[PDB]
Amino acid sequence: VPIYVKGGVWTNVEDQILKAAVQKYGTHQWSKVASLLQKKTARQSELRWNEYLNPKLNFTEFSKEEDAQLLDLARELPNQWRTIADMMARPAQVCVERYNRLLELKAGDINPNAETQMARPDNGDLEDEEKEMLAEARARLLNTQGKKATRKIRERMLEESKRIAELQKRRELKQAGINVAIKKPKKKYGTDIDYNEDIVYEQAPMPGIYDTSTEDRQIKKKFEQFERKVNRKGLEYKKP
Amino acid sequence: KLSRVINGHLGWVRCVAIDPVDNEWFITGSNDTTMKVWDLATGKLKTTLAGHVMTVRDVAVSDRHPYLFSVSEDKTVKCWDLEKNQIIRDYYGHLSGVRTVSIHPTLDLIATAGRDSVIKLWDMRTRIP
Amino acid sequence: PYGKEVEVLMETKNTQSPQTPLVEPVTERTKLQ
Amino acid sequence: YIGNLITRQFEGRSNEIVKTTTKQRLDAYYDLELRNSVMDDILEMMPKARTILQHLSEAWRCWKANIPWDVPGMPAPIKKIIERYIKSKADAWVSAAHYNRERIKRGAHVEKTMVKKNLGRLTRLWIKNEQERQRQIQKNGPEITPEEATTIFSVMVEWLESRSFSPIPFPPLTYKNDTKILVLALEDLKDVYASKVRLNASEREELALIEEAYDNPHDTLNRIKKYLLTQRVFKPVDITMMENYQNISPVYSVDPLEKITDAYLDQYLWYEADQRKLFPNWIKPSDSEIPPLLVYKWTQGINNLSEIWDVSRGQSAVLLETTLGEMAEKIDFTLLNRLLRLIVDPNIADYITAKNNVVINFKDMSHVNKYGLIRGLKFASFIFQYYGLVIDLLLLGQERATDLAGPANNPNEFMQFKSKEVEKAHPIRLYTRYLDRIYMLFHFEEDEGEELTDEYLAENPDPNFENSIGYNNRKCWPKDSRMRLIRQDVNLGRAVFWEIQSRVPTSLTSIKWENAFVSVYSKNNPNLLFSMCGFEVRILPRQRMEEVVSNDEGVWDLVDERTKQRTAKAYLKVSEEEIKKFDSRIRGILMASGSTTFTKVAAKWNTSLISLFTYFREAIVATEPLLDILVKGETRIQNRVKLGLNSKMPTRFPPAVFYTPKELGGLGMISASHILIPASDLSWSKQTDTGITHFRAGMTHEDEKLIPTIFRYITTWENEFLDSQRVWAEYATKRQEAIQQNRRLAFEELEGSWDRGIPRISTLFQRDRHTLAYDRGHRIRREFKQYSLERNSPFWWTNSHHDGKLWNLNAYRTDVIQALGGIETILEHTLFKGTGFNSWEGLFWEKASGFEDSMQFKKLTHA
Amino acid sequence: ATREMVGSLEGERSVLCSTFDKTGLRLITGEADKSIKIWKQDETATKESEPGLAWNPNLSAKRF
Amino acid sequence: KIPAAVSNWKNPNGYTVALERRVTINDGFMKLSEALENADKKARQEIRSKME
Amino acid sequence: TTSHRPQLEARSGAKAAAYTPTGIEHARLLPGHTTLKYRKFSWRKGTAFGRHKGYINDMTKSEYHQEFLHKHVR
Amino acid sequence: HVSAEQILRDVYKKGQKTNIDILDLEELREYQRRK
RNA sequence: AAUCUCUUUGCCUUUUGGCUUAGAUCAAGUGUAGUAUCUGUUCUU
RNA sequence: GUAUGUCUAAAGUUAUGCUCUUAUUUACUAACAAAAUCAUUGAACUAG
């Protein structure tokens, strides 16, 4: 069923998904953020952030100096609530609200100010729609790698299973007295190197003043010994 | 002490070379990809040589030839005939941006180097490195 | 800005034509053709 | 070539190929060198570099967004390094934007992707400048001083008191006209959607809200009034720029729910303002006439001024034309609120000003609009014209404004006066303002002009008489036809501008000489010149002509209503700006239609050509550069189809392919360029009117056939106006007789006149006339659509509901079929004979169904 | 210290290139503020009237 | 010590960071507003002084 | 994705110095400029107002840029 | 109550999720070649 | 004089690797199928 | 529907609470599918 006009009241669940989404996508991808919410648009998610959820916003009780400044700015800049708000470093709706309280909707109505209203609490039984919304949000918030990296993951797993199947068949043949070599990877180009056939690009240590013959013999003997073994047995002052 | 300030380039002035023969003018290369020739005595802009698509990193004027050599981040090395104010030779070969050029004092050869970590010596006439 | 002892110029116009040579070609033999 | 190919066969390909810095690699290579330099400087200043350069990338994104880049705890020298390199990149980016825009303007070669990039760059640069302007205003305060604001307020008070104006009340809860004003508002909002079959989520949301407003009018009216009374904080407005090649223009996208309220308010204010006569007769555009008729009326108005052309006593006439520069952007909201409370209920004024103080967004850029009118608001036209009235009163003064407007009890119609003595009582004979352009006609006696110029020269002496330098003159007319730069006339023109410019404070608008044209008519100057609504006009009195010669269409005869005799001629031309706008529209078609079907390309060409010809008509006849541009445009449109077929071969594309009507499988193009273009010696042409001594070919084809030209099917404006005066006087007489007989006029009692008149007689019986009677300010509303909609009708100047059908091109198709040699000859070019189809009559193309029509709705990739 | 042109950032106060004229009496410098600066020696100076920085080799730095 | 860069536009590893890591007074205005208040009062009173 | 990378170091010409080259003939390397050059050796009283009563090194704020924007954006 | 911190802990737990032996010289060579 | 474990300091040790027009746009869908998934009920435990 | 990638497997023998049954919800994927109002007409057609 389509949804042509989005909006309504902001539930707590939506505010929490929006905050998690902002922590991942930043503040310039409101369409990607809103994509995690079923009933809210990109512009409404941006408004909910800029006017209510952004932690930098000053919602504290107005000081007497701020009350005087508010009345003055309201007289100097008539009806220019966003300019006044910018001067007060407070949300525009908070300033209008305070100004009204300092001068002293209905069922089926559209709320024009919904993005600045307090969040409707999640009652303990989450509706299925919101439960599915949370599941989809957790799934999209988890992903971090693109198609190529993901295919490389599955390809490495398949390459390992092929490797084990190859060794299984080779071991069955060996146990039956049929010795067979393991398949070498096919060359992708004329100069494709087989790194075991030689010490590729060998850089022998620079000769020094000290003789190494007696330790070279020892290393050679140890290398021979190791390889034969593998062949036989395997492996409070803060103040303003 | 400071005596004169000249403005005209639309980007940082990256290189400068004096006329080694008559000392009457000096050429500057800039981030704006152009080269400008200035009168030394008065500082007035004589002419603008436009022949690179990126920052002109170095300029060298021959004391034996009526030639100007210029190198740029666009990987090119160019020889300008100062009798025509036109490019006459291009030296192709640097893998990346060319940072410096030096003209050999007694040979018809130029040295150039840059980000590709090698010095190329070019025969001026054939343009062969 | 720099003091009265410093000449500050703003050069936006080439004072000589593009074809005016920067290094005059020598012509040791006068021709009449 | 072959030696290299064979070398590759034996030796293989080289492994050391160095790619050059071509246009497609310039940005990538620039980035590599910039990053390497930044890294070198940072690493050498410090006692993981790839992580450090991420700050450079962020600083560039911050610069592009105009967001201040500041990293807490960042070492100061490294910050300075990043900042200077960011500025160097910025300088290169801006320089490239200027360079590419200059190329685009002059028609130089520039790739389509580069054009789109340039539009993006100019948009960000414009927003950066706008944000800087707003911040400077907040820092230095308002430019309008307190005493000049007090003066302006008292001027509007004196005017409104003199008119005994009744302020517009808040729309009553039981307002008598609510339903009609609402239908008109929703019609205007719905118009945008009237034929786009493909909608996105935002468009669907707006159209659903409109449909809801039609279904629930009472709840809609209640909501609208509640918002007008109490909503003072509004949602942000999106801004975008439309490409016009010569320039770009802003488009404001307002929230759909707010837009419904704004549209209702706009209709209400214009209706009530019209009922209360808020706007005097001189403010334009006006619902009473289309722009061409405005130009015609103005010309005839000048010609009918008493003794305007006499020069026996050394008299002179001055026509001053200038622009009220940056008028809308310099609007202070406190002054606006105070002035609005003078003409409307305070809740409406407060709503209007609050609606201007909104956030402006473009991608990642965002700022609060604190000063200047947002032209995209539906009621912005009303505010604009009201602030314009303020400026009009400053220019004219209370006394002359009263003479021009007439008493409130009995207002003058446009350009008329209650008496000849009132007309002559003051030098300002005529005044009109078309939005931001003011036109003033002054008449001076020898002593009045001498006294004025003497004072001007006293304040601004010209000892070497160089005042002719930089004196703006109409370049489109020959040297002997444009204004003659005679010392006395040049000085009087400058003195008139100097006098008028002093009357309006610079804080309200920038009246600049470079944006002004001052034409002097005198014993030494027989031609009076002006440009209005895109028309270049030159008035020459008959008494000043060497000989009176007959003229073709494009030279209006001005009749003196007193003697009913022709006393002056008005030569017409299309302004260079409008010529460039037409060429830009053709460029826009070619740039957009990269994958368009041949039929849709031809249809776009037709739309633009018809828009041009039906608007300018006879002014095109003498505009040779426009004929040249028409030839090139039509050729380029045909080349788009030819190139789509990978062939430009002339014999493959006879005229029948392009001009055969759509119902016969042709593209149905309408031609304007198969005409002969006037040619004459250009040297003489620049000095004097050479006539038409030679012709040069336009579009041509091998086939021996003359294609009809669209111009021959559109009645010129002069003939429409004369015939309108006739049919409407006949109608007025029949109306009085119809009531004398106590009859009703029958529908066919006006047969033959139905399709005549301006407005068409048929509009008297428009189906919705009972609602359209309330539609006020409809012309300015239609023109202001340019600021709120990305796609606008090229017919911005006419409304079929109010004007009727102003043209009928059905005869063109008939004559093009005849020109092509008839159906027989046309079909000989087609595959028709191979179809075995019985008759050409049954050739019904299924213009509404096909596979591609079934497919356009499906889930499909861009490819 | 050089002085950057009006409107420049502090980072633009940077010498990028230089060359003496053929006589060595004029120094030409190109800078990040996009300007070219010409420097010359003071002709009114003398060994006694403009001694310059004192010869005082810093022993702390072991570059001797 | 150069702080670690956290971009508000790009997140190549898809990390989640704290919201904190992602995220004009001129007397001429008052003078103008009060001048317009005085002009409003002037007119409001003058009209009455003229009609009576 | 890691395929999109900044440059850690530029490819050195020392690598190509060891390669065995081919004999391709390039158009730009054909003979040209084969000889070197060498140097020698009452109507005016009724209105409310009237007479009767830079270079900076920052492109984005220069008057030139501002007039460019005023000219091209309308 | 749901919280963004809770959501992201559940994402973390949702995402946080064979020992072959070499029996002779031939398998060692295969292994070393691959490595 | 030599172990072991704590705590602080130091080290950050799997500890965000370019560019452009935020690169661009989109997020209304029937049947059937495939994969994952949800509530409940018995059953497992 | 592509680009494109991968596979092709004897012999042509180299010496020694937590789940389950199952009826649904939701998301994603499908060049799979000629779907009954608005003298028989989307119809073999669309790809980086």
From Swiss-Prot, chain A:
Residues 1-57, 60-104 form the HTH myb-type domain. Disulfide bonds: none annotated. Coiled coil: none annotated. Residues 30-53, 81-103 bind DNA. It is found in: Cytoplasm; Nucleus. Belongs to the NTC complex (or PRP19-associated complex), composed of at least CEF1, CLF1, ISY1, NTC20, SNT309, SYF1, SYF2, and PRP19. Involved in pre-mRNA splicing and cell cycle control. Required for the binding of the NTC complex (or PRP19-associated complex) components to the spliceosome to mediate conformational rearrangement or to stabilize the structure of the spliceosome after U4 snRNA dissociation, which leads to spliceosome maturation. Its absence leads to an arrest of the cell cycle, possibly due to the inefficient splicing of TUB1. Belongs to the CEF1 family. Present with 784 molecules/cell in log phase SD medium. This is Pre-mRNA-splicing factor CEF1. The chain holds residues 4 to 295 of 590 of the full protein.
From Swiss-Prot, chain B:
It is found in: Cytoplasm; Nucleus. WD repeats lie at residues 8-39, 51-81, 93-123. Belongs to the CWC complex (or CEF1-associated complex), a spliceosome subcomplex composed of the U2, U5 and U6 snRNAs and at least BUD13, BUD31, BRR2, CDC40, CEF1, CLF1, CUS1, CWC2, CWC15, CWC21, CWC22, CWC23, CWC24, CWC25, CWC27, ECM2, HSH155, IST3, ISY1, LEA1, MSL1, NTC20, PRP8, PRP9, PRP11, PRP19, PRP21, PRP22, PRP45, PRP46, SLU7, SMB1, SMD1, SMD2, SMD3, SMX2, SMX3, SNT309, SNU114, SPP2, SYF1, SYF2, RSE1 and YJU2. Interacts with CEF1, CLF1, NTC20, PRP45 and SYF1. Involved in pre-mRNA splicing. May also be required for cell cycle progression at G2/M. Present with 1770 molecules/cell in log phase SD medium. Belongs to the WD repeat PRL1/PRL2 family. This is Pre-mRNA-splicing factor PRP46. The chain holds residues 130 to 258 of 451 of the full protein.
From Swiss-Prot, chain C:
It is found in: Nucleus. The modification Phosphoserine is found at S17. It comes from the Eukaryota. The modification Phosphothreonine is found at T20. Component of the U5 snRNP complex required for pre-mRNA splicing. Binds GTP. Belongs to the CWC complex (or CEF1-associated complex), a spliceosome sub-complex reminiscent of a late-stage spliceosome composed of the U2, U5 and U6 snRNAs and at least BUD13, BUD31, BRR2, CDC40, CEF1, CLF1, CUS1, CWC2, CWC15, CWC21, CWC22, CWC23, CWC24, CWC25, CWC27, ECM2, HSH155, IST3, ISY1, LEA1, MSL1, NTC20, PRP8, PRP9, PRP11, PRP19, PRP21, PRP22, PRP45, PRP46, SLU7, SMB1, SMD1, SMD2, SMD3, SMX2, SMX3, SNT309, SNU114, SPP2, SYF1, SYF2, RSE1 and YJU2. This is Pre-mRNA-splicing factor SNU114. The lineage of its organism: Eukaryota, Fungi, Dikarya, Ascomycota, Saccharomycotina.
UniProtKB/Swiss-Prot annotation, chain F:
Disulfide bonds: none annotated. It comes from the Eukaryota. It is found in: Nucleus. Belongs to the CWC complex (or CEF1-associated complex), a spliceosome sub-complex reminiscent of a late-stage spliceosome composed of the U2, U5 and U6 snRNAs and at least BUD13, BUD31, BRR2, CDC40, CEF1, CLF1, CUS1, CWC2, CWC15, CWC21, CWC22, CWC23, CWC24, CWC25, CWC27, ECM2, HSH155, IST3, ISY1, LEA1, MSL1, NTC20, PRP8, PRP9, PRP11, PRP19, PRP21, PRP22, PRP45, PRP46, SLU7, SMB1, SMD1, SMD2, SMD3, SMX2, SMX3, SNT309, SNU114, SPP2, SYF1, SYF2, RSE1 and YJU2. Interacts with CLF1, PRP22 and PRP46. Interacts with SPP382. Involved in pre-mRNA splicing. Associated with the spliceosome throughout the splicing reactions, until after the second catalytic step. Present with 1670 molecules/cell in log phase SD medium. Belongs to the SNW family. This is Pre-mRNA-processing protein 45. It comes from Saccharomyces cerevisiae (strain ATCC 204508 / S288c). The lineage of its organism: Eukaryota, Fungi, Dikarya, Ascomycota, Saccharomycotina. The gene is PRP45.
